[PDB]
Design a protein around this nucleic acid. Structure first.
Length: 205
DNA sequence: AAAAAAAAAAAAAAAAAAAAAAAAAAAAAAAAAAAAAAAAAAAAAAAAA
């Protein structure tokens, strides 16, 4: 869907191909910079599938881009600070493949704490063996495979949504005073979730 | 005991400057020789009893 979206996977990408590489200009005295995945996803989305399988030499580069939204490269005669304003959409498998609901999120995925701490939302998709949901998922899959071009009735075309999103990304909403107060109250409640007495949450607030 | 790691650690390929090596390269002027010609001195043969 997205323009400026790049899809990469776990152990198929090197650091240079994930962030930045330098090659010399064949015609002049300058250096031309090869954009990697996190540059081609600037103001877009980088989709890292199999995020748990990425090597630490590459996880550090993802982490640096997720920190300060840049890629500083010093290679082959040129240094340059590139720019990476990329959202990250990552998919990770749990340790041993199956998510263990009797453990914290840290005990379930081998992501480093620096990586995990700067993900806004974690979504746990546990396979619960529910016959009703099995029926519903099976029905939708079979309907997709029976009516290919139809069976999708989406109220807004993807081009419409792309235009709409390009437009709406130009808005910079303010936070009003009442929004400040409500944010503070919601944060207080969220932290109250983290207290003792009540059961453990999968990860701290 | 094997299963991921996580380095050496070797190769091929690249760069990447050095620092050395390699490759390009006729025409203009002169002089000497040999030949001429020219001013001067010198050496010939016609004059007469």
């Amino acid at each position: 869907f997205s323009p400026r979206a790049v899809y990469t996977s776990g152990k198929a990408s090197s650091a240079a191909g994930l962030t930045a590489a330098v090659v010399r200009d064949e015609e002049s005295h300058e250096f031309v910079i090869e954009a990697g995945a996190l540059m081609l996803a600037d103001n877009g989305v980088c989709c890292i599938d199999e995020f748990d399988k990425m090597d630490v030499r590459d996880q550090v580069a993802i982490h640096e881009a997720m920190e300060q939204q840049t890629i500083s490269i010093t290679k082959a005669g040129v240094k340059a600070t590139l720019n990476a304003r990329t959202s990250i959409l990552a998919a990770a498998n749990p340790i041993s493949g199956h998510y263990d609901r009797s453990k914290s999120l840290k005990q379930n995925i081998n992501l480093s704490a620096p990586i995990m701490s700067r993900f806004d939302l974690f979504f746990i998709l546990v396979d619960e063996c529910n016959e009703v949901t099995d029926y519903a998922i099976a029905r939708r899959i079979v309907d997709l495979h029976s009516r290919i071009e139809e069976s999708i009735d989406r109220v807004y075309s993807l081009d419409d949504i792309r235009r709409y999103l390009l437009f709406a990304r130009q808005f910079k909403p303010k936070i009003s005073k009442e929004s400040e107060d409500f944010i503070v109250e919601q944060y207080k409640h969220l932290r109250q979730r983290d207290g003792s007495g009540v059961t453990k949450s999968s990860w701290r607030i």
